[PDB]
Symmetry: D3
Subunit: 241 residues, 6 copies
């Protein structure tokens, strides 16, 4: 291997320059299977990678695991291997009452409630998505006529307190996040997830292109959800090759 965690070589990519990066290792093959010539490359820790072809061009599908830390590793190492465009496809919890489960959300930028983004750029730097990528995802969503929402996403380092969930062992939420969901709601934030702030910030600050699309699994205020989002990211990828 040429990289420390992924266990991949540059030749394994076969010139691929775009990568679809879901969070769950088990979703990798499902995505790769939607394209031509899907082939498993490796599986180490939460990093499962597959290669496939889209319109004749090699494409990579690699899981990031949950959180900005594991995401930063996958992105960095894929970048070392030649990837220049990253499209995250995940699951999300909507916090706006007009966003129903199954809906598709395309993120323009994220509220940085993580710690990893800070390892790439100061907080003043926007965790903004690449225009080309965001455009491709939006156009793709329209192509299949999915109910799409485009906007800001709150990206948290935690699934519980950072998303102001009180149904926990302690039932406590630190001052910083107490009442934070209502604040994000009033600010128009669409949803919560846990990897976009790191992904977008590390890419926008290093000349890498990144997009973010997610399927609504819950509304903080069923199956054809992921499929639609997955179809969208694969279609978007076609326009970014």
């Amino acid at each position: 291997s040429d990289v420390f965690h992924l266990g991949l070589t540059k030749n394994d990519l076969q010139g691929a320059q775009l990568a679809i990066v879901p969070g769950d290792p088990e979703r990798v093959e499902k995505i790769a299977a939607l394209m031509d010539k899907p082939v498993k490359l490796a599986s180490h820790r939460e990093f499962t990678s597959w290669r496939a072809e889209l319109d004749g061009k090699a494409v990579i599908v690699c899981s990031t695991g949950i959180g900005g830390p594991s995401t930063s590793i996958a992105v960095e190492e894929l970048a070392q291997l030649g990837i220049r465009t990253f499209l995250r496809i995940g699951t999300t919890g909507a916090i706006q009452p007009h966003i129903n489960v199954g809906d598709v959300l395309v993120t323009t930028a994220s509220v940085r409630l993580d710690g990893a983004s800070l390892h790439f750029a100061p907080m003043e730097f926007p965790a903004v998505a690449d225009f080309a990528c965001t455009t491709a995802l939006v156009e793709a969503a329209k192509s299949i006529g999915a109910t799409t929402h485009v906007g800001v996403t709150a990206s948290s380092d935690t699934f519980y307190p950072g998303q102001e969930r009180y149904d926990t062992y302690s039932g406590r939420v630190v001052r910083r996040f107490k009442g934070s969901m209502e604040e994000w709601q009033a600010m128009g934030v669409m949803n919560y997830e846990m990897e976009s702030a790191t992904l977008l910030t590390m890419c926008a600050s290093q000349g890498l292109r990144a997009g973010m699309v997610a399927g609504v699994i819950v509304n903080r205020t069923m199956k054809q959800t992921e499929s639609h989002a997955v179809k969208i990211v694969v279609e978007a990828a076609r326009r970014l090759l």
Copy 2:
């Protein structure tokens, strides 16, 4: 009879306008409105000069913001009170990237928040991101005129001098926070420096208002009229696609 404290405008003055082109300089307002139909001066107070025009049958506003986020936040807030829901920032700018030459146009997707006013609307973690529809319209408008466009991040500073790491000053000093900062932004891909977008984009993105920004490159420190006109033509054309 004004409905707002600084702009000296009434909702009636807007004639139903919901979109506003917001340049920084009052002297540029008429020239912009002059590109549209039935342009009429509304008012002039402080750095806030406003004109009303018509685009494809719809009333549009052109109002200056003055220099800086503080002045901008006043114009935007009061315009919002008057009914404006879409704001398009137009201006001329320098550049900090070698590949960006004078005459090019820049469309800002998001801004580095080197201001103070944005913090009065959303914590620093919140992105000073532009509205997708506005950014799309600006890029495509730039497209239709064959403009050489650069789409990316802009550093928005509360100062013209130290915040943009200029040393040709009275003190010749730059506070620790900004020493070596220009090279850091360059390495991070930032296209340029300007002084109102962080405030504009943040206050709009966090209040359900649509905002976008386009600027003509007239200078490049790392290295005049046509550039401007193009930028101006682009913002008006974009406005047309957002009414």
Copy 3:
């Protein structure tokens, strides 16, 4: 035509002036200048309108700063480049103390830094303090004409609305940082709110320039004026030449 980028002034225009009275509104410039000898217009570009006058045979400058720290920072810097060493800001303001009434004059000793520009000159730990000689001159000038004067701290905000905790706005909301802030500043003895002193005082105190500020209260949140505050700033300037 000009030795500076924005003001459109040359050192020659100042005729050796070392002190400038800096109101925020360009319209107030001529009126202030008119109280001195040989007043004459100098230039007008953007929100920067300048006039020159004379006091006790010494040249004095009156130049507007526009609204906010950003425009103020430009004016102060360029005036400093032209030779100005003493700056006296004069404005109108809204008091937040129940016993500071409309018509009263306020002399600021230092300001709460609720701006962004002051940070481009000194870290937050540094005090946005006024020069002692300037503050003394303003206080002594205020007492020579018998105005009801209050000397103390002022809150300097980058915004007219949320930063001064106003809810009579489009969104009707105030970000967490500022919710309940006016009551806190009140309890801390802060006299009023304005929008340029934090930047002015900080940039001058950290660069060897003298700055002071006086303002007339024309309204009180908790429930001719120009002429007096203006009279005070000119009499004070006289003592600083």
Copy 4:
């Protein structure tokens, strides 16, 4: 499942109140194999769990995945399931010249270079380990005579810039971390890893006991990346905390 990510029920724990939490899912079975009656429970995302028995008491081994975010989910849900004591066993990069690859490092407290810890306590709060757990780990390392070091650990949200690694795609390190390794080194910090700040902070601020131990796989004073003792110690330490 009683929890959203682990796919476990309280019954799966069989009364277990202590969990050994490695970062790598593939290390779980290996740890469980050193104990009695090892049984696989589940595997979802980066969370692989096994149950085993130690001195007639049930013990859980569950991976956290890399980083504080994944770790915070594992710890929280295990806590919901009844776990009250957590012992992290991981791998680490030493930043002191005389620490050898293979050495066992027991963490007393961590430098919070993460973001998740802040979701449980403000930065002023110490990412300190529980005294009983730390004592158990040290004492255990003592009974098997392993080369051990006890001290502070820098816990980063990134493997690369946050640990000041420059052999990267960009080759740059943001201002905040430029020259940071030298500073931690001068401050006596022993090593780098990526989960302790979160683990220790979230546990110490919620009445949960946590211990941290790791084996050195690279010495950063020499190289950024390399070309069972710690595992035996965490199991033996666990015996003492039952």
Copy 5:
């Protein structure tokens, strides 16, 4: 006269001492030194009163720090300059947990940094953590002496009043940062409040010096706004 600027002590005055017991009140220095062999007064300047004593044939220093991290940082630094490598703070404290009783002994593993001096040695992310051997010696010494002991986190405040959310004050005002803070620390398991440990533990842990912290509970905040000394002395014995 004096090899250090504030303490008025010379390296010769320590007679090879490498461990110092550092109480806050200068008036308690003599008392502590009295529990050991050959106690001798060394100096008294400002809030710094120092005595030298002997424990199991080894020189030991007892020196007051005065109240707060600033005065503490001076004493620790200058004592370090004179050769001290291990510091054991012994103080008084107010418990904020209902189960901790007045008279109980508290051993601090790490402190919440509500001070400013610690930041002069390490950024906030760094833990104000006690030395492991010192903490162990204190816990063990507590068993030996016999006392209801609690081991845990301590909140170290730069103020006695607003920082410990006390309202019995002239203004009766507590700044936003500290409003409702005591209940937050309570929920997070913090045992008590004191004012020197964050600075002490941080400056020591970040400079290769060993530090331990033990205190006697003199009040319990959930109710209102000699074991420890014997324990710190016994712990010192185990650390020589």
Copy 6:
């Protein structure tokens, strides 16, 4: 509870005899020295680093109470004196200047301080200015002229430490944390006159609570110069600053 209205100072309101102004030096040993410049001085109490005396100035009761080193001990003294009735505080110290033109023996009157402390934050957020009261500053400047000293009026850097916070490297570790590396040069360039360790807390806690506070100090050493005053760096310069704080107090009664 041994006839004290406060927890640390061991003083009662009766002890102040109506005093409303307090001179607050840092060293308890200097309290008696300062009280000696006034009439009928009497020692009130001595507890921890808090030594207090009462004296008469132009026939009015005045308190002199040490604060100890640092904002924490200072905040205790000021708060408890406030509870007892003090409304005006004048700090008098000896300090080391960081400006080349500020010579030993000079007197420094502080208008505001750089908050390099932690206690000030317990009274007001960092954005708040650690500014001195105008009346107090005026009295100190005027008294300086009555005495005839070479005075400098300006900003002071108030640090929670004597060593790294004042960027001193002659220490056990010989290192200075990132935040303070190169900080002295920055403060010098910003016109900061000197370093001391109590003003940020004193000025902030008073300005944010309706109390008046002033700060004056004698320059007994200069961080930029090679030579250092003899055995008595303090005494003469110290006496100058002390004479001034007392003279200033007279105008604030």
